[PDB]
Design a binder for these strands. Structure first.
Ligand SMILES: Cc1cn([C@H]2C[C@H](O)[C@@H](COP(=O)(O)O)O2)c(=O)[nH]c1=O
Ligand SMILES: Cc1cn([C@H]2C[C@H](O)[C@@H](COP(=O)(O)O)O2)c(=O)[nH]c1=O
Lengths: 319, 319
DNA sequence: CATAATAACAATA
DNA sequence: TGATATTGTTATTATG
DNA sequence: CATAATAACAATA
DNA sequence: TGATATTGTTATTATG
């Protein structure tokens, strides 16, 4: 089903890491590599269970969230090396209790958000800053700008986004564009995978599109194009983190620090406040503009983070 | 654990039904009664499985939602008759697939709601009608009135609600009261079971409280007091249905028919529109006023049903 | 003498 | 109703 | 001659 | 991460 095979992505990573001139050892990837190796020729389920047990034991002392992520790394390797039918996929898994608990923690944090939204007092400043970034010659700057003005995920904006003009009857839409290249999504109906769909933008569409074409045409943009999430991460993440931190440090709400995804959160609040037609709920509207699954109203809870000072003002205008 | 016992509630119902002068036969309750009987002395799991299988087979041809409800009836009987440790409780259950599907259907309908809210054009009329009902001498009328002005569930208002004045510093709150007697809730932390808590009212608290005391003091109110859900249902439900239908038929939004629970839905929309402080989301606010569990933001999706014509007007006031 | 580079470690949607 | 893909933070490594 | 009463049947939160 | 409690609709029954 079969009993042999290799998780090639892991191995290439190990081989490249063999001659770095700095950095941590790839101990986790090495464990995975050896685990897949030891599986080769293995046919008894008890053997498989013993091997996984050894693994799980190593992992103890890590955070729950870490452990869960690692189980994903292993399972993705087993699938890579042996396929979808390997009996180890029923064995190498966390128990139901760990996932249940994970979900309890997630949901509690969110409910705390919903109870105490952050007033984003200088949101106009932040949006203008992003707009200013759209005219920068530095493609990282353009990219930040796009995350704020379009609300796409960094990985989307930088590596795989397709933007196009959205028609408005006989003309082109001024406040919205077409987007393709939704991440965190596999093929399935009611999924936006490889689906093109209209989204609002927080500045003139012409600007956004122009700026994106500059991004895609720069040398760095051609390098970024089509990267894996791993490569995108290691190539760009810490720099994007420090850049975004430096850009908004004295305008960002004092409750939190400025993080790239904040632009996506803020985007949704702002677009809802400006564009939501009246027969739609906040949940449904977010989930629409954010490319969430059909009948997925729950992922939208994650994004209710800020309250605009105008809303805060006039809700205070009672008696 | 043990092998003998009786589901007394079922049996009393059968015995009383023995001499009605009208009405359907209690065939379902009789099946349950016989099933519990046949369980007496039964010790082998295969025997138990055979008995449940026979049952499930009878039930086929009913709606999924019906079937699920019936499985609740049976399981509640087993628990009543033999306790929580009886091995039949692991056998008499729907499969995971049925519950999963149930949830898929529920969630799809809700997402359709969220996409197409109903504009409750005459909501002011409806609320005044409820207010007018608060001064009626007929306790069913007072009760309807209370469901609209307080958003409590019919079963709550009629049989077990405790209302009290809510203090406001040194005085009594004018727009809110204290409520105890939350239904659909078992003891557990982060549950409002036997918990008293402040809720908004859509007319002067003094009125609401006065009217409720009249309700509780009428002969019919003393009869309603402390009823089981079954008795409340059979005593009052069809009348409350027809009364509510006749009361609002020409003011209720034409998309649906006037149903008692609509007052609870409308209540939440209206109270949010008038009272929600600005650092709270719609989800968290509903779940608060509706007595939902802590960190329960999902039950609140069910209530997003209507859009107020004022909201609809000024969201239309874009460009 | 100390710090950039890298992956482990971790949280979020 | 089963067990993921992205974003965010920090410890450890090699290096004139 | 037909209809109120009752529980089955069903959906919702 | 297991398998409920309420609200809403209709078929069937007994009955001068
Ligand atoms: C347990 C599990 C969680 N998730 C993610 C999506 C949910 O928003 C989140 C809840 O914790 O976990 C999956 O994508 N697949 C899974 O199997
Ligand atoms: C499956 C299940 C559903 N429910 C209810 C509550 C949820 O809102 C609803 C989802 O379908 O079902 C329970 O209370 N317990 C259960 O075990």
């Amino acid at each position: 089903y079969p009993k042999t095979g290799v998780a090639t992505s892991i191995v290439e990573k190990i081989e490249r890491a063999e001659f770095n001139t700095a950095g941590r050892k790839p101990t986790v990837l090495l464990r995975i590599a050896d685990f897949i190796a030891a599986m080769n020729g293995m046919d008894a389920k008890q053997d498989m269970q013993a091997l996984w047990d050894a693994e799980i034991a190593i992992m103890n002392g890590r955070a729950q969230t870490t452990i869960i992520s690692y189980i994903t790394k292993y399972r993705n390797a087993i699938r890579e090396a042996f396929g979808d039918d390997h009996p180890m996929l029923k064995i190498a898994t966390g128990d139901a209790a760990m996932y249940d608990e994970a979900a309890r923690v997630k949901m509690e944090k969110i409910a705390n958000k919903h109870g105490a939204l952050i007033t984003f007092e200088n949101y106009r400043q932040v949006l203008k800053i992003c707009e200013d970034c759209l005219k920068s010659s530095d493609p990282l700057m353009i990219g930040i700008g796009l995350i704020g003005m379009t609300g796409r995920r960094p990985y989307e904006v930088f590596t795989q986004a397709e933007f196009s003009p959205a028609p408005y009857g006989k003309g082109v839409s001024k406040w919205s564009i077409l987007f393709n290249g939704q991440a965190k999504t596999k093929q399935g109906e009611g999924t936006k995978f490889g689906i093109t769909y209209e989204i609002p933008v927080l500045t003139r569409s012409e600007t956004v599109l122009a700026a994106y074409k500059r991004l895609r045409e720069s040398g760095q943009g051609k390098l970024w194009h089509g990267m894996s999430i791993d490569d995108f991460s290691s190539e760009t993440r810490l720099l994007l983190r420090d850049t975004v931190f430096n850009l908004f440090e004295d305008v960002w709400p004092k409750e939190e620090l400025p993080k790239p995804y904040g632009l996506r959160h803020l985007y949704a609040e702002v677009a809802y406040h400006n564009f939501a037609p009246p027969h739609v709920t906040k949940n449904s509207y977010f989930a629409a503009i954010l490319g969430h699954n059909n009948n997925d109203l729950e992922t939208s809870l994650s994004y209710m983070t800020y309250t605009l000072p105008e809303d805060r003002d006039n809700a205070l205008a009672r008696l």
